[PDB]
C-alpha cells in the first residue's frame, strides 16, 4: 500500500514539477461557481480542490504550514517531499523496512540543518535601502510572472521601504503588519505608468461637491462612525407619525438641526469628514457649501489602518468634534486612474505612515490579477528578514542543492552502519531541483547535468573550495554556450525559506511511510 | 500529460475553423441561435464570438483578446483570433518530436521584438501631402463599398458619408453616435442624412392627416409620466355611497389629468416626448393648441435627444425649469420610405446623428448597415492615429518575408521557430483568397515573386483577382491594428500552450 | 433616560453612570501606591472577568 500511495502522490508530484521555475507551466482552475481562474502558486490550487486520500492530506496540511511564517516554498515542500518517497521505492523493493528509512532521514536532517549555517555567504544588514531591497525581492518575483521581474522590482522595493521605519539594533518593538501593504489593480494602461505613493487608495467616487482640497498642509480629518442625521435620544426616541400637521415640523425641524450640527463641526477647522455609514441627502448639501470634503468608507477594515496613518479616531456618536482626536493630512485630491476619477490619500515628507498602497495598471485583468498574488507573496518574503538570523542567505537556482549533495556523501562514509544506504539516497533526491529547471526550460537534461557536477567538483590545494562557490543552474535561452553567475543577477533564496521548507518536507515525507494501512468507519 | 496539451490545441481549432470564413468583408457569416431564440447575422467577429460561450477554458482566452481588440481598436477582431490559434496549429508536429513547448513559446516573442521595430519602419505619416480634406474621405469611402450591390449607387452614398464625420468633433469620434434605422421599401439611392433622431410612426390612433409639416422654432419637452383618462386596455372602478358623486369622481379624474395638461400649455412646448403611451384625451386637447406629442418613445432614442438640444427630462409638469426645454432649427415630416416619419434637423449642439437607409428588404439594408461601419472605423482611426500602413495583406506579407532572412542569421533552435512563425503568417492572405473564391495556390505563389524585388507595398486586389498595390486601390489600415494584433495573438498563444492540465470543479 | 440639551451636557450624563464605576476604580489604583508604591519590582494586573 505504501508503493500504491506513492503512485497517487506521483500524479500530484508531476503537477508541481511544471510549477516551480520561471519556465514552468500554469494550470487553469475552473471553480464550481462558474469562474475560470489561473495561477502559478500551487497552494491556491490545493484550496479549491477537495483533498481526500490520506497520503495527499499530509502534503496539503504541510503546504498550509508553508503559507504561515513565510510566503515562499510552496513548490519547494511539495517537490522535495515528493521525491523523498520516490527514491525510497528502491529501499522498499530491496526489503528494507520503512522504520529504519525514517530513522535514516532523521540523522541526515540534523546534518543538513547544521551545514546550512556554515554555507551562508552574505548577510542582510537590514539597512532598508532601496537598492538593498532589490536583491531580496527580484528572485521572489521570478518563477511567478515572467517579464515583470525588472519592472516590479522598483515598485515593490519602494513601497516596502516606506512602511519600514528607521531603526537599528532594536528588536523589541514589532513592525511589518501584513495588511499594511495593499495591492489594487485597474484595467487599462500598462506597468510603466505605475508609481509608488505613501497612503491608502480608495476606489469610491467623490460624491461631494468638493473634488479636491487646497494645497495647505495638515488638513484635519474627522472619522465619524455614526451616520449623519438629527441627534436622537439613546433611550427609545422612535419617530412616529400622527397627523399631517406634524409632517411639516419633521422636515423643517430636521432642516435647522442638521444645519446647526454641521455648522459647529465645520467651524472647528476640520476640512474632511469621514462617515463610515450612509450619508443623508440634507446633510450632504450643508457640508458642500462650507468646503468640506465628504468621504464615505463603508468598510470597517479601512478605518483601522487609517488610525495609524492620519491619526484620526472613529467616534461612535455624532456632534462631538474633539480636536484632540483629529488627524492631519497635507494633500487630499481626486486623480483619474484608468479612466475613473477617485479620491486618493497621500502625504509628502511628514507624518510617517505605516500603511502604503501600490497602484497597478494593465490591459488584461487575467495576468494582472496574478501580479497581485505575486506581490503579496513578495511582501511576505520581507518577513523572512528578522532578528533571529533572518538576514542569512544562500545561493539559489540549484547552486546550494548540488553543492549540498557533495557534502552529504562525505558524511555517509564517515557514519558506519546501515545508515549509509539512507544517506546516499537522501543526496540523490536533491537532483529533482536542477532537472525541474532544465526540463521546463527546453534545454537538454543530459547536457546540463554533467556540466553542473564538473563546476561543483574541482581540485584545489586545500579542503575548502575558494574561488567559485557561486555556480548555479542557469536558464540559458541563448544561442550557443555559456552560463551566468548567481552573484551577477543576485537571484537567490533566503536561508529562512530553505531551512523551513526542508525541515517540513522531511517530516512530511517520513509521515507517509509511517502509515501502511488505512481504516475507514462510520463516525 | 502531453496528450492534454495537444487536446487543448485541437479544441481551439474548432473555434478557429468557424472564424476563418468570417475573415474579410466578402467572407461568409456565422449563424448563431441564442438561448433567447433571437437570430442575429453579422460579419463582425466580436459579437459573433461573444455568443458562443464555450465552456472550454482555452476558448475563453480568445474571448478576452477579442474584447481588447474591440475596445482599444475596434477592427480586426476576426484576424486576431485566427492568428492567435494558427501558431498552435503549426506547433502540433513540433511537440511530437520531443521539442519542449517553452522554447516554442519563447521563440514567438523573439520574432515579435523584430516585428515591432518593423511596423515603425513601415508606418508612414501623411496628412495634407498629395491630398486634402474632402479628397481623403471621398477616395477612401469608395474602397469599402467596392464589390457590393451599392457600388453603382455609391456616388450618392459617399457624399452622405463625408458629411457624417464632419458633423462630429474630429478629435473624438464614435461610431455609435451615428444611428441607422432600417426602412423597408423604396429605392436605395433616395436615402438622406439626418442630423437629429427619427421615430418609427407607431401611432394607430385616429386624428391623423391633420398636422403642419414645417415648424419654425418649436420647444422640445420630455415628460417621464403618462397622461391619460380612459385608455383602450384598462378601466376605472368608481364605487361611492352617493348617486350624485358618480359623475363627480369621473369629472374629478378629468380635472387631475387636465391639471398637468394646462401646465405644459402655460409653458408652450410644441414637442412632447414620453416613454409611456398617451391617451386620447391629451392628443385631442393638444390638437386645437397646435401641440405635438409622441408616446412610447424608446429609451435609447430619448437619451440621444438629451445630447441633441441640451435639455433634460423632468418627472412632473410643475417644477420643470426653463433650461430643460430645447429648440431645433427645422422640423419636417416627409414621405421618404413610403411612410410619414418625423425627425429633428439642424441641432447645433447635437452630439449624435442618424443615417437612414432604404431598400426592398430589411436584410439587404443590414448588409449595407454593416458595410458602412467598416468605412467609419477607418476614418475613426485615421484622425487620432497619424500612422497609416498598407493593409489587405500588404503589411502581412512583408512581416513574413523579413523574418525568413533573420532565421539564417540566428543560430540554434530559433531558426526553425521563426521560420515557422513567418510561415504561419501566410494564413491571413490565404483565407482572404479562399473566402472570395480566388485560387490560393497561384496567387500566393505569384505574389511572392515581385514581393522579393524590393517593393514592400504590394497588396492583394479585392476587385479583380491579380497581384497589385493596395496604395492605388486605396486600401488603408492604421498602425494600431498591426501592433495590437501581434501582442494579443502572442499572449493568447503563450497562455494556452502553457496549460498542461485542465481542472474543472463541479458543484 | 438621558436627556441632553447640548453635546457637552451628554458627556456629563455618561460620566455620571461611570462615576459609580469610577468610584470603585479610584480605590483600585490607590491600593497599589498604598502598599509598596515606591518599592521596586511591584505591579498590578487586572484579572476582572
UniProtKB/Swiss-Prot annotation, chain A:
Function (record text): Molecular chaperone; assists the folding of proteins upon ATP hydrolysis. Known to play a role, in vitro, in the folding of actin and tubulin. In yeast may play a role in mitotic spindle formation.
Protein name: T-complex protein 1 subunit theta
Modified sites of kind Phosphoserine: 479
Pfam families in the record: Cpn60_TCP1
The protein's assembly and partners: Heterooligomeric complex of about 850 to 900 kDa that forms two stacked rings, 12 to 16 nm in diameter.
Subcellular localization: Cytoplasm
GO molecular function: ATP binding; ATP hydrolysis activity; ATP-dependent protein folding chaperone; unfolded protein binding
Family of this protein: Belongs to the TCP-1 chaperonin family.
GO biological process: chaperone mediated protein folding independent of cofactor; protein folding
Keywords associated with the record: ATP-binding, Chaperone, Cytoplasm, Isopeptide bond, Nucleotide-binding, Phosphoprotein, Ubl conjugation
Record's GO cellular component terms: chaperonin-containing T-complex; cytoplasm
Gene: CCT8
Swiss-Prot record, chain B:
Domain of life (superkingdom): Eukaryota
GO (cellular component) term, any one: cytoplasm
GO molecular function: ATP binding; ATP hydrolysis activity; ATP-dependent protein folding chaperone; unfolded protein binding
Isomerase as UniProt keyword: no
Cellular compartment(s): Cytoplasm
Pfam family for this entry, one: Cpn60_TCP1
Spans traversing the lipid bilayer: none
Primary location class: cytoplasm
GO biological process: chaperone mediated protein folding independent of cofactor; protein folding
Keywords carried by this UniProt record: ATP-binding, Chaperone, Cytoplasm, Nucleotide-binding
CDD domains: TCP1_eta (cd03340)
Function recorded in the entry: Molecular chaperone; assists the folding of proteins upon ATP hydrolysis. Known to play a role, in vitro, in the folding of actin and tubulin. In yeast may play a role in mitotic spindle formation.
Family statement drawn from the similarity comment of this UniProt entry: Belongs to the TCP-1 chaperonin family.
PANTHER family: CHAPERONIN (PTHR11353)
Description of how the protein assembles with itself and partners: Heterooligomeric complex of about 850 to 900 kDa that forms two stacked rings, 12 to 16 nm in diameter.
Protein's name in the database: T-complex protein 1 subunit eta
UniProtKB/Swiss-Prot annotation, chain C:
UniProt superkingdom: Eukaryota
Subcellular location: Cytoplasm
Family the UniProt entry places it in: Belongs to the TCP-1 chaperonin family.
Described purpose of this protein according to its UniProt entry: Molecular chaperone; assists the folding of proteins upon ATP hydrolysis. Known to play a role, in vitro, in the folding of actin and tubulin. In yeast may play a role in mitotic spindle formation.
Oligomeric form and interacting partners: Heterooligomeric complex of about 850 to 900 kDa that forms two stacked rings, 12 to 16 nm in diameter.
UniProt protein name: T-complex protein 1 subunit zeta
Residue numbers of the full-length protein present here: 250 to 298 of 546
